[PDB]
């Protein structure tokens, strides 16, 4: 009887296994039979804690998709992992260094049982964006067609471009979205952002990606809204941000600092299987 | 001998922890592969009285040195690659059963010495996090290293 959990994080269910205290290996061919709903679990991505490769970290952990394949995007599931070690007592820290497919980071449980990342220092450069512009400005005058329209525009390891609408179900997002996410100007594409300010530490958002379109949640694209509505002034600190998959708290202290982005994790059941 | 009828020499095994929750992984002598500190028991000796010795004689700490924090029920049993079964020495020895004990370091990291002995089994030793013994220990060491430190993990993290 192999144990797990079912968790949900940024709009998307995970099945987490404790694979630290607990002897399963995971072939394609067994995650294949685990993402079925009713031979297995049912899931849409696998969450696997696995001990350390490096004596100076604390976990390892793996994401596989229901098709059985890893899965190596940057600070995934990052929520649920911090918070499944802590309930299943595999660790009492609150400062969790773990490494991924794609490095390894610092997570932070506030006490409020809330999952802090370090996300880097927001980029306006508009050479590593990358994006077609002489030089770096607050915000961009771009021509969508037809409409004229104005943007701040940032990397954070990706391309964002973001635009204040005022209000987020007031949004062409299906029309003008693709126009932006395929301009010109953006060579490697952008994803563009709908921002509309409530106030100047809360704020509704809906993020049209750079080739799947709108998603639940969109980790990068919150914080680049929250890291221009800075840079240009618009927006304090810290930050709530809205969007369909739910609520995420973001903290800057503006160039020279690293983005802290918060979100939660909910711990959804407690699981049997025998394989 | 000691050994028993199945073949399984008694053991005795050592996670010496800190005060950071880390634990002690040692090199054995002029090779390559780490483990905790274990070591067969003697005739007429307990489990304890095994342990305090072998203690200090491959990591040279003393009674007042470490402090006992806990320690397994019963016996857990590995058995060896049988391509390292010794057959012609008899009674052979096909594998360990090991009850294995939980120590806090009291004293400094100074108070290590893996030289106490003629015969030292270990030339080296660090720090690790408290998971990593999981994955690097020898294959047929790792079902017990499982137990041993799920077993254990609650008194460790229940200190600062
Ligand atoms: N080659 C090898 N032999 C092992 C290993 N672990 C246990 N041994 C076996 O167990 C013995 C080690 O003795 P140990 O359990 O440390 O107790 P002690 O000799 O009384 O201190 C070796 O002589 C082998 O028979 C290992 O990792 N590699
Ligand atoms: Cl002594
Ligand atoms: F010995
Ligand atoms: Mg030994
Ligand atoms: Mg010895
Ligand atoms: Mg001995």
């Known amino acids: 009887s192999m144990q797990f959990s079912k968790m949900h994080g940024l709009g998307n269910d995970f099945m987490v296994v404790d694979a630290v205290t607990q002897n399963v290996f995971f072939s394609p061919e067994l995650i294949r039979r685990l993402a079925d709903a009713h031979l297995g679990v049912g899931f849409d991505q696998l969450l696997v804690v696995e001990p350390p490769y490096d004596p100076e970290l604390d976990f390892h952990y793996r994401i596989f998709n229901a098709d059985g394949s890893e899965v190596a995007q940057c600070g995934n599931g990052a929520r649920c992992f911090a918070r499944f070690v802590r309930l299943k007592g595999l660790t009492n820290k609150r400062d969790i260094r773990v490494s991924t497919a794609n490095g390894r980071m610092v997570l932070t449980v506030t006490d409020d049982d809330l999952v802090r990342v370090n996300m880097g220092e927001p980029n306006f450069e508009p050479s590593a964006v990358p994006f077609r512009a002489n030089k770096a400005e607050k915000t961009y005058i771009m021509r969508a067609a037809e409409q004229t329209i104005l943007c701040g525009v940032v990397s954070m390891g990706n391309p964002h471009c973001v635009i204040q609408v005022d209000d987020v179900d007031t949004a062409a997002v299906e029309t003008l979205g693709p126009v932006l996410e395929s301009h010109e100007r953006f060579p490697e594409r952008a994803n563009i952002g709908f921002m509309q300010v409530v106030k100047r530490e809360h704020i509704r958002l809906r993020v049209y990606e750079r080739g799947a379109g709108e998603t639940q949640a969109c980790g990068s694209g919150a914080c680049a809204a929250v890291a221009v509505g800075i840079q240009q002034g618009l927006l304090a600190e810290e930050v709530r941000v809205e969007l369909p998959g739910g609520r995420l708290d973001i903290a800057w202290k503006g160039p020279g600092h690293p983005l802290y982005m918060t979100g939660p994790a909910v711990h959804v059941a407690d699981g049997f299987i025998h394989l | ?160």
């Not at chain 2, 040195?65 to 019963?74: F, H, K, P, Q, Y």
């Not at chain 2, 008899?90 to 059963?97: A, E, M, S």
């Open chain 2, 1 to 160: 001998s000691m050994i028993d009828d199945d073949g399984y020499r008694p053991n005795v095994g050592i996670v010496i922890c800190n005060r950071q929750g880390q634990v002690m992984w040692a090199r054995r002598f002029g090779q390559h592969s780490w483990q905790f500190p274990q070591g067969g028991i003697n005739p007429g000796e307990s489990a304890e009285q095994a342990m305090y010795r072998e203690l200090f004689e491959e990591v040279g700490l003393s009674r007042k040195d470490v402090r006992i924090l806990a320690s397994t029920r019963n016996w857990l049993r590995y058995k060896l690659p049988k391509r390292l079964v010794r057959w012609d020495t008899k009674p052979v020895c096909i594998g360990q059963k090991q009850k294995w004990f939980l120590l806090q370091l009291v004293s400094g990291d100074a108070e290590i010495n893996m030289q106490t002995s003629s015969t030292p089994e270990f030339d080296g030793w660090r720090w690790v996090s408290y998971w990593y013994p999981v994955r690097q220990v020898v294959s047929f060491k790792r079902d017990v290293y499982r137990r041993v430190m799920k077993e254990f993990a609650s008194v460790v993290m229940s200190l600062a």
